[PDB]
Design a protein around this ligand. Structure first.
Ligand SMILES: *C(=O)N1C[C@H](NOS(=O)(=O)O)CC[C@H]1C(=O)NNC(=O)[C@@H]1CCCNC1
Length: 466
């Protein structure tokens, strides 16, 4: 077994994320060591090992011809412990993984085990491509450029970490997507870990929250309920719903708005004020089937096909016939469960004039053809409405991106609550879709969207549209 050089992983711009570095691995023929017992303690000492346990190991493996002394000394360390000239103690040239970017891309990149086999993230998902084959000569693995832009990953990392301090939040995730190419430009979770130093790792730090944390998305799916309304042929943006007095009794169940200073709202109005009553009334009119079908088409509670280890799917229940309560709770985003990634993919499809491009964690050179999941006119209309949610008076002013026109929706996700913002920018010719998730910290995640989106657009040289 002559181990193969494992393929380099870079960011989209070639910055190194996972590098296999030549290390030395001392191994021993025990049967040949049992003849030079007087050398053992010099050997043990140079391996910073206890003489008795070193000896006890060797003694008990007397009838075996292979054991590992130390795995992965530097070039000149392993050469010092072979210059002692101990009988039965030979050299192997091996490869150790180093992660130059560390904490910043830990969850995305993942890491290899003691064998240099993929254990988490991209290192596992692309193991066959990255590994090559052992020596027959050893054929080296192949280079992999990720979709991640390390400039955007660091900006996203920095800003989510800050926002978690201010709000005394213990966890969160942030996803950034290219709405045109389906590329994940940034995926960051907190807490994070350094994959270079893996002794005592709190298992909550290992959780890739963007891909495994499932939640009811709440008010962030209203734009998709609105898309279904505009495609029904029964609703235009300027049509009015009466939401007074901000409550609605469903037989026994009672729906309450957070803001109840409204009678007549147009369809834009229902999104600015985020009226559960307004969206429920529309939902009764068009039926839950139209809402289910839009949500399914944009990939909520659906397999993302990233083939990424651990990635959860959530659940979008096909009740086939919905009573009035299940109709309302689906329309304002309880009664389904989704990941941050699914929700950013859905928003990407909306931002890209209703065309869903398949998700990619790898650099996309030739973009695959999208699928038209929402008609281009409906998608253009809902973009206009979500621009008003950020821009208009009463709106989420703290999501405004100075220089650009941003579009988006806040929500509270669900037991345990997360603060959510989902949006895209620029509103005129959308480039980036973003989802922010902050655990049990409306106006928490929205300022992060603002700061990270301002940086991302400038880092991608998107001309200001305002
Ligand atoms: C959205 O997630 N909503 C709608 C509303 N305002 O949204 S926002 O803060 O402007 O983004 C209020 C918060 C949230 C919501 O609906 N929360 N709770 C509900 O009313 C449901 C009642 C049933 C149990 N929890 C959900």
């Amino acid at each position: 077994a002559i181990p193969a050089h494992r393929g380099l992983i870079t960011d989209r711009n070639g910055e190194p994320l996972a590098v296999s570095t030549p290390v030395t691995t001392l191994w021993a023929n025990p049967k040949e060591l049992m003849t030079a017992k007087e050398r053992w303690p010099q050997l043990a000492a140079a391996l910073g090992q206890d003489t008795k346990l070193f000896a006890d190991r060797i003694e008990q493996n007397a009838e075996r011809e292979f054991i590992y002394l130390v795995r992965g000394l530097t070039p000149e360390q392993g050469e010092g412990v072979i210059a002692l000239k101990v009988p039965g103690v030979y050299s192997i040239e091996e490869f150790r993984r180093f992660y130059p970017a560390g904490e910043v891309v830990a969850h995305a990149v993942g890491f290899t085990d003691v064998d240099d086999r993929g254990r988490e993230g991209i290192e596992l998902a692309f193991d066959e491509w990255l590994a090559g084959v052992p020596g027959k000569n050893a054929k080296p693995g192949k280079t992999l450029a990720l979709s991640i832009d390390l400039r955007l990953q660091y900006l996203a990392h920095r800003e989510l970490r800050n926002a978690l301090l201010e709000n005394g939040a213990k966890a969160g995730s942030l996803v950034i997507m290219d709405v045109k190419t389906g590329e994940i430009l940034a995926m960051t979770n907190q807490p994070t870990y350094n994959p270079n130093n893996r002794r005592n790792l709190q298992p909550a730090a290992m959780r890739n929250r963007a891909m495994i944390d499932v939640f009811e998305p709440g008010s962030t799916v209203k734009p998709f309920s609105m898309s279904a309304a505009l495609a029904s042929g029964r609703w235009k943006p300027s049509d009015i719903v009466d939401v007074y007095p901000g409550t609605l009794q469903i037989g026994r169940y009672t729906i309450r708005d957070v803001s109840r200073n409204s009678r007549q709202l147009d369809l834009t109005g229902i999104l600015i004020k985020s009226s559960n009553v307004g969206i429920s009334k529309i939902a009764f009119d068009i039926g839950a089937e139209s809402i289910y079908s839009v949500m399914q088409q944009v990939g909520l509670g659906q397999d993302t096909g990233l083939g990424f280890p651990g990635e959860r799917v959530g659940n979008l229940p096909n009740h086939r016939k919905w009573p009035k309560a299940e109709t309302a709770t689906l329309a304002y985003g309880y009664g389904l469960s989704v990941t941050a990634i699914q929700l950013a993919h859905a928003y990407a499809a909306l931002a890209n004039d209703g065309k869903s491009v398949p998700l990619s964690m790898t650099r996309v050179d030739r973009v695959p053809d999208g699928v038209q999941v929402i008609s281009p006119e409906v998608a253009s209309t809902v973009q206009g409405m979500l621009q008003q949610v950020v821009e208009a008076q009463g709106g989420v002013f703290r999501a405004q991106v100075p220089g650009y026109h941003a579009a988006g929706k806040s929500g509270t996700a669900r037991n345990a609550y997360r603060s959510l913002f989902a949006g895209f920018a620029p509103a005129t010719d959308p480039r980036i879709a973003m989802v922010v998730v902050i655990d049990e910290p409306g106006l928490v995640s929205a300022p992060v969207f603002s700061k990270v989106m301002a940086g991302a657009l400038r880092l991608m040289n998107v001309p200001p549209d305002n």
